[PDB]
Write a protein that binds this ligand. Structure first.
Ligand code: NAP
Ligand code: DM2
Ligand code: DM2
Length: 274
């Protein structure tokens, strides 16, 4: 099958591309800047921008299935071009915050455009990415083998990006996923303190956890920049994002147990080294 993967250079898309290519599909990788190593050997890199849909004309020509990275502003226009091109199937990178009812204005409009098109679809709704912990704790672990945390006894069910790619790949390539939205959590509830331990384990190094205040925290997050600054308000509960609920995992789709945060830490150990 001819499959175009948008979000191809991303945490999830890199994996989707590699697996579709191994299955021997005819794979195309959309990026805003075409260069070697955006995709593996034998994968066609197409230059284009989801915010400028006319740039996608050549990328969508002759395509059977599409992995769609979420861009609510143009989703309807991109879906419309997919439909014109004769795409039969769209698999969406969405968010478990849609399942929860928190997201009605970013990922949901992308889903809604896809649902309204008449093509086959599957929504992949990951919960909290394990990658968030490289983004937030990488810099200080790499600097000082320390983590500064206001909520060490808090936590959720972080999900391994390869679980997300596994589900996307099946939705793009087998029957029985049409009209499903799969919410993807990690297999265990873990405290931030436990998450720091598992990184310490994966690295084979001590990491000191310094329990700080939320105020101290946000200054540190604003100093650090990048992911930690851009989301600091939402991460410390200064602004609202929106006995537990039944927590679904990739097992429901793959037939295999969801990857653990321990496994995730081992896969990314070297990215935490100084
Ligand atoms: N972090 C979480 O906990 C969380 C939870 C739920 C859902 N999500 C969803 O997952 C996404 C993150 O995916 P990820 O981590 O795989 O992505 P990533 O590695 O952070 O994202 C990079 C990918 O998005 C592509 N992209 C972005 N804007 C584009 C545009 N205008 N035109 C074309 N391509 C564009 C980039 O292409 P280039 O090569 O052009 O840069 C790149 O391939 C989030 O945006 C969110 O929608 C995240
Ligand atoms: C049961 O779910 C949770 C349980 C514990 C903590 C959490 C959550 C949770 O749902 C959650 C989020 O959904 C979001 C965030 C988050 O920290 C948490 C938890 O901490 C951060 C976030 O707001 C941003 O980074 C945006 O800058 C993105 C996201 O918000 C969602 C909903 C927004 N209204 C918006 O639609 C955005 C795009 O996605
Ligand atoms: C069940 O959902 C969750 C449960 C617990 C934690 C979480 C989430 C969650 O959904 C979530 C996110 O969706 C996003 C983030 C996130 O931290 C969480 C949780 O922590 C971080 C974020 O800033 C990025 O990494 C950059 O794209 C934004 C990202 O999504 C979207 C929304 C952002 N506002 C940003 O504008 C862009 C649209 O990415």
């Amino acid at each position: 099958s001819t499959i175009l993967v948008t979000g191809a250079t991303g945490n999830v898309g890199r994996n989707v591309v590699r697996q579709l290519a191994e299955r021997g599909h005819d794979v195309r990788a959309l990026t805003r800047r075409a260069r070697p190593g955006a995709a593996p050997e034998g994968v066609r890199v197409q230059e284009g921008d989801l915010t400028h849909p006319k740039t996608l004309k050549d990328a969508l020509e002759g395509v059977d299935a599409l992995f769609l990275f979420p861009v609510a502003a143009t989703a309807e226009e991109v879906v419309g071009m997919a439909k014109s091109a004769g795409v039969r199937r769209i698999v969406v990178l969405s968010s478990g915050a849609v399942t929860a009812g928190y997201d009605t204005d970013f990922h949901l409009p992308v889903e809604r455009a896809v649902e309204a098109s008449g093509l086959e679809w599957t929504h992949v709704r990951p919960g909290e990415f394990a990658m968030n912990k490289l983004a937030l704790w990488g810099p200080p672990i790499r600097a000082e083998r320390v983590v500064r945390e206001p909520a060490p006894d808090a936590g959720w069910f972080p999900v391994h990006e390869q679980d997300i790619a596994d589900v996307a790949v099946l939705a793009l390539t087998e029957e029985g996923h049409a009209g499903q939205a799969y919410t993807l959590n990690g297999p265990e509830l873990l405290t931030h303190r436990r998450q720091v331990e598992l990184i310490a384990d994966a690295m084979g190094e001590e990491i000191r956890l310094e329990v700080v205040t939320p105020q101290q925290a946000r200054e540190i997050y604003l100093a650090q920049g990048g992911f930690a600054a851009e989301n600091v308000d939402f991460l410390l509960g200064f602004e609202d994002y929106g006995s537990l609920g039944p927590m679904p995992t990739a097992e429901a789709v793959t037939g295999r147990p969801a990857r653990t945060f321990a496994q995730w830490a081992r896969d990314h150990a070297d990215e935490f080294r100084a």
